[PDB]
Amino acid sequence: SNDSSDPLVVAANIIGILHLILWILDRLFFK
Amino acid sequence: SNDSSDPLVVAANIIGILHLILWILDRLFFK
Amino acid sequence: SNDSSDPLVVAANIIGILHLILWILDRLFFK
Amino acid sequence: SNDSSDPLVVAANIIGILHLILWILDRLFFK
Ligand SMILES: c1csc(-c2cc(C[NH2+][C@]34C[C@H]5C[C@H](C[C@H](C5)C3)C4)no2)c1
């Protein structure tokens, strides 16, 4: 079942997107 | 149709590239 | 054997995750 | 030929790795 798509690929994309939420927030209060 | 390639993979690459544009800009005015 | 999954994909996810560990730590002592 | 592996996937991993080289350098001179 994981042959079609591995959880690492899905998690990787999710992790990167989540990072943007936190990094973007910091950019909002940039100095 | 999405079996060949999922939109998450394409979006992930696009999101990462876009992040660089914003992060790179900040690096330009580094201090 | 690498046809099923290339090491680049696995390494890419690992590299991104590792980056978060270092970047997250910096955010902890943010100023 | 690109069916086996798309250039976007390879480029994505390369782009992320390259980002670390620049981001890591900044961390070296952290303040
Ligand atoms: C489908 C097949 S391979 C495949 C795949 C995903 C990745 C990692 N992508 C990242 C995109 C952004 C966000 C994360 C760090 C890097 C920039 C690389 C995850 N590497 O390969 C997907």
Automatic annotation (TrEMBL), chains A, B, C, D:
Top-level taxon of origin: Viruses
UniProt-annotated site: Essential for channel activity, possibly by being protonated during channel activation, and by forming the channel gate and the selective filter, residues: 19
UniProt-annotated site: Seems to be involved in pH gating, residues: 23
Glycosylation site residues: 2
Cellular localisation: Virion membrane; Host apical cell membrane
Transmembrane segments: 7-25
Function comment: Forms a proton-selective ion channel that is necessary for the efficient release of the viral genome during virus entry. After attaching to the cell surface, the virion enters the cell by endocytosis. Acidification of the endosome triggers M2 ion channel activity.
Oligomer and partners: Homotetramer; composed of two disulfide-linked dimers held together by non-covalent interactions. May interact with matrix protein 1.
Other remarks in the entry: When the channel is activated, one or more imidazole moities of His-19 probably become bi-protonated.
Recorded domain comment: Cytoplasmic tail plays an important role in virion assembly and morphogenesis.
Protein family according to the UniProt entry: Belongs to the influenza viruses matrix protein M2 family.
The protein, known as: Matrix protein 2
Source organism of this protein record: Influenza A virus
Higher taxonomy: Viruses, Riboviria, Orthornavirae, Negarnaviricota, Polyploviricotina
Parent-protein start and end of this portion: 19 to 49 of 97
